[PDB]
Design a protein around this ligand. Structure first.
Ligand code: PMP
Lengths: 425, 433
C-alpha cells in the first residue's frame, strides 16, 4: 500500500482510495494529517533560526518555551526537561543517566533495569534490550547485560486457571518482588513501563497492578520510568497515561507525538531526586558528557509548542476521552462475535484479539494468520489498522468524531462477518 | 524572573553543559540567523565559524529549505511506509557515494545511525554463522555519538566517565595525532607505520576471527580536528583487508564538501564498506541521518521522516546547483593558508586542517607542548576573547576549531582569521601582565 497524502483522519493511496488511519500512523499523528498551523509554525521558525544547538551553555527561544511548557504540564512535580530526536534515543539516554546517577550517589552496583515482556521501548542496542518483544533480540545478541524482564500483565494470556484479575495483579507484583530480592535489591536502579503496552498488543494492565507494583518499588526506593511514548498527550482519556493509571514516575518519557509526528522530536522529564545528583556529578567532571546534535531542535520545538497549543485550544484531551468512551463501548458490542477472543482498551486505544476457538483461545495456524487475514479485508473496507499477531489495534487521531468512530467500528464488524463466512471453508 | 535565561535555568537540562555552572551563569540565547552569522537575543552578531555543530552547510538563512519543508508537511507530514522524498533521497545518496553502494538506511541522528550499524553487523555475523565476529575497533579521541553503543565507540573520556562505558565488544586503538603521539625522532610516515602495526597487534591479540569492523572518521572532528599522518589510511586499509575486517567511514562531519571533496573518503582514498552521514546532509535544518552499505555487507542479509527527507533533498540540490563543494574547496585553500601564517605565533603549538576544517592548538611552552593549568584553560580563555571579537569557535581542550559554512567567501575568511590573530595577541599580552 503506497500512501501519498493525508487529510484529517484519512490517508490516500496513489490510486485515490481513502482510508481511515486507525493507528494515526505510528500511534503518533494526534492532530491528524492536515493541520495547517503546524506547517505555519515550522516555516516561520525555519526562516528565523533554522538551527542552533543546546550544547555548552547555548539555547534558543523555542526549546526554552517547550521545556517550561512540558515541566508545567507534568502529571507529578518535575524539575527539568531534556530533549532528543526519538523515543528510542530518549530511553537510551535515560538508561545512561540512571547509571550516571547511581555512580553520582556512591552506588556502583545499582545499575540493573527491570522491563517487561511485550513492552516496547525503542530500537537502539540499549532500548531494544529494554523492549520485551522476541523479534527485537536473539539475532542481535540482545538484551545487553543489566536489563531484566519481568512478566507481561496480560490477564487474558497470562492468568492461571481460576485466577481472578486482582489476584493476577497481586501475583505479578509478587513475582516482581521475587525478582528484586533474588537479584539483590540494592542492585536494581529502575523499573520501566508503559502505562498501557502499545506495540505489544494494547495490553491494559489488570486493575490494582500499578498500585501494587508501585508499593514494591517504593519499598526498595527503585526509580519508576513511565514510558509515555504512545500513551502521552490524550491517548488514554487523560493528558498522560500516568494520570489514567495513577502512576508517580520519577522520569517521564515522551516521543514525537509531542509534535504529532510532524517533525522528529522527543523529550523526557526528570524530578528533583534525579536531577540534583546528576548536576553535581556534571560539575565534578566539568560537563555532562552526552547529547545529540539536534537536541532541542528549534524548528521541531516550535512545531511541538504549536501542537500542544492546538491540543489545549481545541480541547482534544476531552474529545479523545469522549470519542474513546464511545469507541470502547462499540468495540465491546462485538464481544459475542464468533471470532472475537478479547476486546481491551482505555480512552482512545483498543485492541481486538481474534480467535477461532474461544475456550482454547486459539486461532489459525500459525498465530498471526487470522489477524493478517482480517486486516487485509479491513483495509479493503477503508480502514488501516495494525495487526499485532492476531490482535487488531485501533488508535485513531484525537480529532476523530463519533460519526467517524461509528464508520470505523462498522467496517470492523463487516470485516469479521466476511472472515467468518470465508473460514467455512 | 521570566526572562529567557532564567526560564532556561529553571526548566531545561542541557547537553554537554556543567549543570551547576549553568544555574549560576545561564545560557547565551541565540535569536536568529543570517548567512554565516547568528545574532543573540541582545542583538550582538557573530560569525558562526563552527557552522553550529559543524553542520549548517548552507548557512542560517536559506528560505528554499523552509519552502521544501512546508510543502511536504502540507502534503503528507508523516508516514512509516515507503516515488516520494524518502525513496528519492535513498536513490540520490547511493548515486553520490564515493564507492559503489547498494542500500541506504535512515535514522534521526548520527548516534542512531552508528548504533544501528553496530546492530546490523552483529545480526550479519550471526546470519553468516560467525557468532564470535562481533568486536568493533574504534580509536582514542574518535567521536561517533552518544547512545550507549555509539558513546562506547566514541573515544573521549568525557563520554565514558561515570557512564560505565564502553560496553563489551568495543575496542580502541591509538589516536593518529602526530603532534601529540609521535615519539622523539619519529617521522610522520613512521608514525603511520607504527599505528598500523599497533592495529595489527590488537587484531592478532584479540583473535582476528573475532573482529567484525573498524570505524573511523576520515578527519576526527570533535576529538580536535585530527588530520591523520600521510600514508595512515593506506596502511590501515592494508591491515583490515588482510583479516577481512569491514571498514566503516563515519562521514557525519566530513560529508558533503567539508574536506575539499564531496566526501572525506575521497580526500583520504578510503574504500569503506559502510558510510555514515548526517549534519550537512540537511544542513541541520531538520534532524536526519543515513548510512549506506555496499553489496558485500548487504548480500548475506538481503521509514525515514518524509519532511526531513524533503529538506535533505533540497539541501543537496542547493549544494549542487550553487557549486558549494568547489566554493568550500577554494575558500578552504585560502583559510588553511591564512591560518598557517600564525604558526610562528608564540601561543600556537600546531595548525592542522584540510579543506574547510581546521584546528589551532594553543600552548604557552612550545617545546614542552604545555599550556596553562589545567589543559583546556588556555583554549577556554582564547575562545571567550574570540567571541568578544564576534567569532564563535569551539574550544576542544586547548584547540580552537574552525569549520565555517560552505557558503563563506574569502573576505569573511579573512575577517575570521584576523579576529583569531588579534585574539592570540590579546591573550599573549594578558598572560605576560
Ligand atoms: C563524526 C560523528 N559521528 C557521529 C556523531 C553523532 O551524531 P548526532 O549528534 O546527530 O547523534 C557526530 C556528532 N558530533 C560526529 O561528529
Amino acid at each position: 500500500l503506497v500512501i501519498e497524502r493525508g487529510d484529517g483522519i484519512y490517508v490516500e493511496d496513489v490510486s485515490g482510495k481513502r482510508y481511515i488511519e486507525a493507528m494515526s500512523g505510528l500511534l503518533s499523528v494526534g492532530v491528524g494529517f492536515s493541520e495547517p498551523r503546524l506547517a505555519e509554525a515550522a516555516a516561520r521558525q525555519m526562516k528565523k533560526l533554522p538551527f542552533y544547538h543546546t550544547f555548552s551553555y547555548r539555547s534558543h527561544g523555542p526549546v526554552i518555551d517547550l521545556a517550561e511548557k512540558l515541566v508545567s504540564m507534568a502529571p507529578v512535580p518535575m524539575s527539568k526537561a531534556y530533549f532528543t530526536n526519538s523515543g528510542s534515543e530518549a530511553n537510551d539516554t535515560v538508561v545512561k543517566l540512571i547509571w550516571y546517577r547511581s555512580n553520582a550517589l556512591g552506588e556502583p552496583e545499582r545499575k540493573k533495569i527491570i522491563s517487561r515482556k511485550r513492552g516496547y521501548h525503542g530500537v537502539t542496542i540499549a532500548s531494544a534490550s529494554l523492549t520485551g518483544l522476541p523479534n527485537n533480540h536473539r539475532s542481535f545478541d540482545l538484551p545487553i547485560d543489566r536489563i531484566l524482564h519481568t512478566g507481561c500483565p496480560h490477564f487474558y494470556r497470562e492468568g492461571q486457571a481460576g485466577e481472578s484479575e486482582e489476584q493476577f495483579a497481586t501475583r505479578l507484583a509478587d513475582e516482581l518482588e521475587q525478582l528484586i530480592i533474588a537479584e539483590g535489591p540494592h542492585t536494581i536502579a529502575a523499573f520501566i513501563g508503559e502505562p498501557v503496552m502499545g506495540a505489544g498488543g494494547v495490553v491494559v494492565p489488570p486493575k490494582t497492578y500499578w498500585e501494587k507494583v508501585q508499593a514494591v518499588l517504593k519499598r526498595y526506593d527503585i526509580l519508576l520510568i513511565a514510558d509515555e511514548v504512545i500513551c502521552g498527550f490524550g491517548r488514554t482519556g487523560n493528558l498522560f497515561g500516568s494520570q489514567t493509571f495513577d502512576m508517580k514516575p520519577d522520569i517521564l518519557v515522551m516521543s514525537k507525538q509531542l509534535s504529532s509526528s510532524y517533525l522528529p522530536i522527543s523529550a523526557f522529564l526528570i524530578n528533583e531526586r534525579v536531577y540534583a545528583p546528576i548536576a553535581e556529578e556534571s560539575h565534578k567532571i566539568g560537563t555532562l558528557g552526552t547529547g545529540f546534535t539536534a537536541s532541542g531542535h528549534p524548528v521541531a520545538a516550535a512545531v511541538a509548542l504549536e501542537n500542544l497549543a492546538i491540543i489545549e485550544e481545541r480541547d482534544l484531551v476531552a474529545n479523545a476521552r469522549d470519542r474513546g468512551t464511545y469507541m470502547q463501548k462499540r468495540l465491546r458490542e462485538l464481544q459475542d462475535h464468533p471470532l472475537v477472543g478479547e476486546v481491551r482498551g482505555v480512552g482512545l486505544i483498543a485492541g481486538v484479539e481474534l480467535v477461532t476457538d474461544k475456550q482454547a483461545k486459539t486461532g489459525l495456524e500459525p498465530t498471526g494468520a487470522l489477524g493478517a487475514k482480517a486486516n487485509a479485508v479491513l483495509q479493503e473496507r477503508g480502514v488501516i489498522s495494525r495487526a499485532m499477531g492476531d490482535t487488531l489495534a485501533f488508535c485513531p487521531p484525537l480529532i476523530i468524531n463519533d460519526q467517524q468512530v461509528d464508520t470505523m467500528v462498522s467496517a470492523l464488524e463487516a470485516t469479521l462477518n466476511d472472515v467468518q463466512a470465508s473460514l467455512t471453508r
